[PDB]
Scaffold this motif. Sequence first.
Motif, mmCIF file in Angstrom:
data_model
loop_
_atom_site.group_PDB
_atom_site.id
_atom_site.type_symbol
_atom_site.label_atom_id
_atom_site.label_comp_id
_atom_site.label_asym_id
_atom_site.label_seq_id
_atom_site.Cartn_x
_atom_site.Cartn_y
_atom_site.Cartn_z
ATOM 1 N N UNK A 393 0.870 -1.133 -0.005
ATOM 2 C CA UNK A 393 -0.114 -0.065 -0.100
ATOM 3 C C UNK A 393 0.913 1.210 -0.094
ATOM 4 N N UNK A 394 0.669 2.021 -1.267
ATOM 5 C CA UNK A 394 1.583 3.336 -1.226
ATOM 6 C C UNK A 394 0.623 4.457 -1.049
ATOM 7 N N UNK A 395 1.176 5.208 -0.199
ATOM 8 C CA UNK A 395 0.061 6.267 0.191
ATOM 9 C C UNK A 395 -0.121 7.352 -0.731
ATOM 10 N N UNK A 396 0.760 7.270 -1.609
ATOM 11 C CA UNK A 396 0.922 8.446 -2.696
ATOM 12 C C UNK A 396 -0.155 8.003 -3.749
ATOM 13 N N UNK A 397 -0.677 6.980 -3.721
ATOM 14 C CA UNK A 397 -1.810 6.384 -4.710
ATOM 15 C C UNK A 397 -3.115 7.539 -4.249
ATOM 16 N N UNK A 398 -3.151 7.475 -2.910
ATOM 17 C CA UNK A 398 -4.667 8.168 -2.210
ATOM 18 C C UNK A 398 -4.031 9.667 -2.122
ATOM 19 N N UNK A 399 -2.951 10.043 -1.761
ATOM 20 C CA UNK A 399 -2.381 11.115 -1.467
ATOM 21 C C UNK A 399 -1.035 11.607 -2.144
ATOM 22 N N UNK A 400 -1.371 11.843 -3.490
ATOM 23 C CA UNK A 400 -0.145 12.120 -4.496
ATOM 24 C C UNK A 400 0.271 13.433 -4.147
ATOM 25 N N UNK A 401 1.713 13.888 -4.370
ATOM 26 C CA UNK A 401 2.269 14.834 -4.605
ATOM 27 C C UNK A 401 1.416 16.092 -5.559
ATOM 28 N N UNK A 402 1.646 17.454 -5.350
ATOM 29 C CA UNK A 402 0.878 18.428 -6.036
ATOM 30 C C UNK A 402 1.647 18.479 -7.357
ATOM 31 N N UNK A 403 2.657 17.916 -7.688
ATOM 32 C CA UNK A 403 3.134 17.910 -8.912
ATOM 33 C C UNK A 403 4.285 16.616 -9.069
ATOM 34 N N UNK A 404 4.527 16.229 -10.308
ATOM 35 C CA UNK A 404 5.734 15.476 -10.721
ATOM 36 C C UNK A 404 7.017 16.190 -11.234
ATOM 37 N N UNK A 405 6.931 17.340 -11.342
ATOM 38 C CA UNK A 405 7.692 18.282 -11.810
ATOM 39 C C UNK A 405 8.958 18.675 -10.597
ATOM 40 N N UNK A 406 8.814 17.654 -9.584
ATOM 41 C CA UNK A 406 9.937 18.025 -8.615
ATOM 42 C C UNK A 406 9.792 16.815 -7.709
ATOM 43 N N UNK A 407 10.962 16.537 -6.827
ATOM 44 C CA UNK A 407 10.844 15.211 -5.998
ATOM 45 C C UNK A 407 9.612 15.590 -5.065
ATOM 46 N N UNK A 408 9.291 14.467 -4.812
ATOM 47 C CA UNK A 408 7.784 14.314 -3.725
ATOM 48 C C UNK A 408 8.278 15.007 -2.272
ATOM 49 N N UNK A 409 9.622 15.075 -1.982
ATOM 50 C CA UNK A 409 10.011 15.500 -0.827
ATOM 51 C C UNK A 409 9.729 17.033 -0.697
ATOM 52 N N UNK A 410 9.762 17.687 -2.061
ATOM 53 C CA UNK A 410 9.254 19.149 -2.278
ATOM 54 C C UNK A 410 7.672 19.546 -2.511
ATOM 55 N N UNK A 411 7.051 18.281 -3.286
ATOM 56 C CA UNK A 411 5.751 18.621 -3.363
ATOM 57 C C UNK A 411 4.638 17.844 -2.779
ATOM 58 N N UNK A 412 4.946 17.190 -1.773
ATOM 59 C CA UNK A 412 3.853 16.345 -1.077
ATOM 60 C C UNK A 412 2.789 17.355 -0.532
ATOM 61 N N UNK A 413 1.780 16.631 -0.806
ATOM 62 C CA UNK A 413 0.336 17.440 -0.409
ATOM 63 C C UNK A 413 0.044 17.191 1.066
ATOM 64 N N UNK A 414 0.281 16.085 1.605
ATOM 65 C CA UNK A 414 0.078 15.664 2.891
ATOM 66 C C UNK A 414 1.187 14.884 3.924
ATOM 67 N N UNK A 415 0.970 14.986 5.173
ATOM 68 C CA UNK A 415 1.817 14.262 6.114
ATOM 69 C C UNK A 415 1.007 13.570 7.080
ATOM 70 N N UNK A 416 1.878 12.543 7.645
ATOM 71 C CA UNK A 416 1.339 11.455 8.515
ATOM 72 C C UNK A 416 0.873 12.453 9.881
ATOM 73 N N UNK A 417 -0.551 12.123 10.288
ATOM 74 C CA UNK A 417 -0.912 12.797 11.182
ATOM 75 C C UNK A 417 -1.073 11.707 12.492
ATOM 76 N N UNK A 418 -1.613 10.683 12.126
ATOM 77 C CA UNK A 418 -2.067 9.843 13.355
ATOM 78 C C UNK A 418 -2.192 8.434 12.731
#
Length: 589
Positions: A393-418
């Motif tokens: 289960x790959x979280x980026x399938x449900x919560x993808x980055x805001x772009x693919x024009x940059x690494x995911x560690x720059x464009x991520x849309x969400x962070x783990x909360x709980x």
Amino acid sequence: ISERDAVKTAISLVGTILGKLGVPLVGPIVSLYSTLIDVLWPGGKSQWEIFMEQVEALINQKIAEYARAKALAELEGLGNNYQLYLTALEEWQENPSSTRVLRDVRNRFEILDSLFTQYMPSFRVTGYEVPLLSVYAQAANLHLLLLKDASIFGEEWGFSTTAINNYYNRQMSLIAQYSDHCVQWYRTGLDRLKGSNAKQWVEYNRFRREMTLSVLDIMTLFPMYDMRTYPMETKAQLTREVYTDPIGAIGAQGSWYDSAPSFNTLESTFIRGKHLFDFITRLSIYTGRSSFSASNYLKKWIGHQISSQPIGGSIQTQTYGTTSGSSVIATQQIGFTGFDVYKTLSTAGVLFAYTSKYYGVSKVVFDAIYPDNKYKTTFTYNPGSEGIGAQEKDSEVELPPETLDQPNYEAYSHRLNYVTFIRNPDVPVFSWTHRSADRTNTVYSDKITQIPVVKASDGPKPSANEVGHYLGGDPISFNSSGSTGVIRLNINSPLSQKYRVRIRYCSSVDFDLDVVRGGTTVNNGRFNKSAPNVGWQSLKYENFKFASFSTPFTFNQAQDTLKISVRNFSSIVGGSVVYIDRIELIPVN
């Protein structure tokens, strides 16, 4: 799959708009339309058909052919007309005094507005309002951004004051109407999915997550397209938590939910009680060993201890599952303080035994970054399994980055909360917060800062209602006099900068409100009721109003506090209520 694609599109779109919120300059606006048009009309294929396929898959209903065919034709033609409007804006931006050019841009804009007016009913065909909701949300969004250009550029293009006011009044009417349609059909859509078993719960929660992302999140931004209310750059935050699918194996050889608790048991266990906006600080995972035969074994997550913290508040620790006794063969402690976990890759395991199956997570990779100094690290849970079935289960399938024009560690849309959990089957659920919701409650000298009061360090928790479907997160409620928590703030320079405050609220009563800064009152006033005495489900867009003060103040220091107090309710009858959504800080010069 259309769902992944649609969610990818919707997340990207909210990320782009969030970066331009309140900007009045033509350069940024041309650049924005360029991006929007690329995403929504990539060519050779209908990106809008993907929005339809998404919600049809989530609810298991089919849009009638006639209704699909027409909306698709109308949306493709709107796209062609959008290219021409973009080209007319580009030719205006570099020949602004030409009369041919001004007539052209004005004419393209009026053609769009006219098409929006004609076409919107096609995106809410009776019997299909839900499967067409993500189309409707994205089209509505476009229409309100268009009306905002009338506000910024209308006079320049030679509209009369009457035309400009009409456009502005329609935009206000349409913000309300489009917001209401979204929230309403979001609620109906989700309610139609309420069931009795765990499989139904997975479906219901998938619609909830996907439509928060595809419908609610963009709708939340609609008020900031009002350029009279937001005449300058604005920092908006989405504070709602979304939950990814449960981390349990699914398929034809056996699903975790084949033998699991009811719907209601999952909803009350997987989903957190209402809480102040918080950040994970520590996780301990407890491991058990299930074995079958000599070389097949599953070492799996059988319980955990999790710590989180509101901004500048106390750390709370809860426990889930099995965390002591003979079953616990290993523990692992993970320090998460200050870390944005932007991706999880989990292995949902199944151990096949002669007469039973054992489900459980055998491995989780947490990709993390420290947004302060951009330091990156991986945390891996892998006690070691062998001879098992597994699903990644790959979280980026449900919560993808805001772009693919940059690494995911720059464009991520969400962070783990709980993380929540059930036993037998041993299944965790991950919850996540949006990137726009900062860690520091930063106050900008040169922007309108929005600060949801749910970002307090302590005090009252949100009440059990979904009024935040309109707000992008939970309001704080009062049935009688009280205060928000102490909201802890980081003030950007210069500390000599004046600010005034307005507070977004909804109440069935008139009330006294004051703003306490650093411990002392800086604003006090009476405000009027904005809603009738009805259940929260009946509240609409128009029931939200501003408590606005003109008397400014300064902060005392870089690390300051704010606190809102409400008092002296005009009625104490049953239903008397003040909801407080957010404070907006406006630099006064």
